[PDB]
Structures are given as structure tokens and as C-alpha cells.
Design a protein around this nucleic acid. Sequence first.
DNA 1: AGGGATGGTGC
DNA 2: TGCACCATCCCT
Length: 580
Amino acid sequence: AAMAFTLADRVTEEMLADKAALVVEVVEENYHDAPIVGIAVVNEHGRFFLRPETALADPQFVAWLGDETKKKSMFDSKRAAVALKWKGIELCGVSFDLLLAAYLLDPAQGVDDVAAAAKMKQYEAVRPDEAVYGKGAKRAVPDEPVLAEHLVRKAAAIWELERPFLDELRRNEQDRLLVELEQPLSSILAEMEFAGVKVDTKRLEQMGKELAEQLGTVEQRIYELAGQEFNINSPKQLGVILFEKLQLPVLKKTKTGYSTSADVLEKLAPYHEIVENILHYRQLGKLQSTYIEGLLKVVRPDTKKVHTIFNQALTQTGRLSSTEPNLQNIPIRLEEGRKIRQAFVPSESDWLIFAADYSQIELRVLAHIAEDDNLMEAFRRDLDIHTKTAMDIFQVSEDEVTPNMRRQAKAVNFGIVYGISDYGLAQNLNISRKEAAEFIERYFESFPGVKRYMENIVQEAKQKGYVTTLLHRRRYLPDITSRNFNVRSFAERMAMNTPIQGSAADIIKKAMIDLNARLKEERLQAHLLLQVHDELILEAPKEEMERLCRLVPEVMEQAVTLRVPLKVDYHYGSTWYDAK
DNA sequence: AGGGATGGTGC
DNA sequence: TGCACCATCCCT
Ligand SMILES: *Nc1ccc2c(c1)Cc1ccccc1-2
């Protein structure tokens, strides 16, 4: 059963062929400045295992790594690329990434290691990473003999699986999506994570101090109003105080005890002064624990930068996700939380933060795919889409649209952009399900194209078994045929929503690639720092702002050509908060 | 030490 | 609780 391979003590020319499966193993989940525990190379000349201290110190090996003409096939090349960036080594020539290939073929499979991908093609001569490294506290790098065989088997699997994976992608008409979009994007994300974002820790620490003070104040007030002290953070104890001791009404139940979510508390506020204080306590606590303390934990003391990791092969819609820290969910809606963004600053003196965001890309994509005459005309006129929606569903003139009418029309659009359930809408409008469905009915009368699209896409999902995005990303929806109403309804919502969310993801991804090509052609020092679904955040010398103001929006707006224009707004300032 | 339940940020 | 990540509480 054992797999043959050479445990090399030195690097040989045979190991530097122009085509090979390459494994540069980084076991630590966060690969930033992390160790490379071993190297495996599989090519036409055989299978080899190399100790990192040796390989990475060899001029020839390093040169082979950085030679774009020497093609490598890998699994999660970004992990290797970044780990190597921290060591000052450039990785080039990656022509195939099995992780991204598996992700495109079926995001739902949840492929996170070579074994999971190989299993898709009935290849099982390789162990799951968790089985070799263990999990959690018991996690550890095994002895060399065990380590080396694992890495060689992973390289071997990649070597064998490249062809079948590429062939299926071609059949799915997704080979260009891999080769021209995701793989090039992987290199861009690597540069972004490696660059990182500078943090004003002093500012964060001072905010933390002020929060602790307000938190202590509110906390005492809460005990005062409750007549005793308790753990405000335990839904259990909190429930006893609110619903038992204070006799507040139970408007919502939970599969445990009482519900204490913000939306529930807001409704209870009129009954007792303790409620508003609990709401306020949570607001501050969220900022303190999750953002202030959470951010300070991951900032690198030597550079005062945070280096997020963009998971490129996770979401079911084609979006990226961000972790340790998650820089895609920094507060902005409420002013108090928004202030957190003042802590994110340019990495160089006299540089500024520049942010560009698509204006309603999801609804513009919807107008395009549904070919709805009314919605397309609205965007061609660059109308306020919520006011316009209110005018149509309520049958009134623009001057007749009240603030509440626009708010509810906006809730309807928010529901369509995110594919929320009918139940989620009724509450967002704080009305009855019967009345909610009635709003949707009026919307379809005003946007019959959107109606037809929703009906047609659900039918297509059932027929083909999946739905696709503009650039051919796909999502299988097996629940679309379920006889369970709730399970089927969810699948139907995804059939409608994935082409919208997924196409928006495809577009901004291509925009990033197009943008980097333009920045290079122009020799601008500006560079991408973050992507937050429908917006790109960069930093650059103050002297490049005027040029970026014209270049970034244009590139983002021209990434793709739709039946309606794409519109991008932009701002810049001394901190992220200022890049309004 | 893990991890499910609940709650809250973002798009 | 649409797509995500992660905080604290608290049972096992
Ligand atoms: N996608 C989605 C699903 C359910 C719910 C929302 C969005 C918002 C909300 C508010 C209250 C209950 C349920 C939901």
C-alpha cells in the first residue's frame, strides 16, 4: 500500500521539471508568518519530499519556485504563496489550484483538504488532513516518516486529479472562470492579506477605556433597576429578571427559554426602563468585546497591522469571507460603532484610504437578468430605487412618497436582494404575513419581468438541478424538489437569489483583476487592501487620489457590460472612517 | 477543552 | 434569520 518516494537530503535538477504537483505545507490555520513544515514534489521523474530548511535555502529551488514558466499544480496555493511571502520568497507559475477547482464544481461539498476533493472522483489513496494532524489541542505535526508520506500522497492526488477536474470544468463551461478569474484573483488576495491594514492601537485602546467606563455605569444602573445583580450576558438569567421578576410580556419564545434579541427588547422598552439600558449595554459590549478587544488581539505588535485571511473557497454564492480578523463586518450603520473605523489608517505617511462601492449592484444585476422594462428604465435614469419602488407599489407620485413609504419599499428591495423568507419580510415591516405577501403582489405588478424571472429560474433549477451566475459559477439545489414546504421554499429562494448575489460577486472579482492590471500599467503605488462584497478599499499616496477618483470607478463600472449601467461611488480620507 | 444555543455586526 | 464571522454563556 505504501507509496514510493525519495526522502531527499538535497535538491536535484530532476525535482525542477517544468510541470509538477507542488505541496508547501503550512499546518497552522492562520498562515501569516507561519512555519512551512515540509515540501513535496511530484513530476514525470517521480515523487520527492524535501525538508523546508534545505529546499528554501537552495538557490535553484527558490529560482524554480519563482519561475513563471515552471508550472505547478497545487491545493490552496494562496496559503503557500503568503507563507512564502513572509519568508521573502516569490511563488509563480501556479497553473492549477485543486481547492478552487473543487469549489467551482460544487461549493456545497465543503472541500477543505485534498482528500475531500479527491473523494469527488472516487480517489481515496490520501488521508484527510485532520486525520494526520489531529484537531484542536491535540493538533500536532507528526514524525517525518508520517509527515512525508502524507505530503507525497497529497501531491500525488493533485498530480492525478488535475486532468479530470479540468475536464469537468470544461464540460460545465467553467474552465475560464477558474483560469481567468479565481486563480488570478487568488494571487491578488495574497498580496492584500500580506500587505495588511495599519491599525492605530492607541486610538483603539483609548476607545476601549471609554467603553469600559460607560459599560460600568450602565451595568450598575441595570442592577439598580432590577433590584439585584446578575449576569446580563446570560439569556438565562436575563430572562428570569425580565419575564419573571419584572413580569414583562413574553412576545417571543426560544428553544430553551425566553427570547431576548434586540428586536424583542425594543418592543418591551415602553414597559420598563431596564430594557433600554440592557439594549445600550449590549451595544457597548459588542463594540468592546468583538471589535476593540477582538482587534487588539490580532494586531501584530511589530508593525501594528492586521492581516486578515480571505477564504476564497467557502461561500455558496461566490463571495469571499474574512477571518482573524473579519474585516468585512466592521460597524458603520450606527455612529458610535462607526467610530471604530478611525482606527484603520494608511500604512505610510502622507498616504490616504480610498474606498469605492457599487451603487445597488444587486438590483442592477436583477434588472439585467430579468430584463424587466420598468426596473431597467429606473436604473437608466439613475433613479432613487427605493423611492421609485414606493411610487409603483403604492401608486403615488414622487412628491407623495412619505418617509415610511420609502422605508417599507426599501425593506421589500432588501428582501429581494438577500432572498429573505416571507416571514423575515413581514417582521422587517412589522406586519402580518398576509399583508406582506400583498406587498410582494403589488411589486410583481409593477415589475412583471422580475416575476417571470423568479418563476423561470425556479423552474430551471428544478430542470437542470442547479442555477448559474453571469460568469458560470454554479450552485446545486437538490431541495428544490423536496415535498417539505419549508425546505423547498428555501431552495426556491436560493434559486432566485444566487444568480443575483453570485453575479455581483463575479463582477467585483473581475473588477479587482482589471484594476490591478490598470494600477500596474500606470505604475501607481496605490494598492488594494480589502474587498467588502460590493466595495473595494485601497490606500495610496495623497498625490494619487485625483487619478484614483477617475480610474477606480471606471474600472469597476466597466468590468462587465449589462443592459443597465453600473454605477460606483467613491470617497477618501486620512482614515477608513473618513473615506465616508 | 469542545461546541451547541443565542445574539449581533457586515453586505 | 437570506451569504458570512464571532462574541459569551454553559452543558458535557
Ligand atoms: N434571510 C432572512 C431570514 C429570516 C429573517 C431575516 C432575514 C431578518 C429577520 C428578522 C426577524 C425574524 C426572521 C428574519
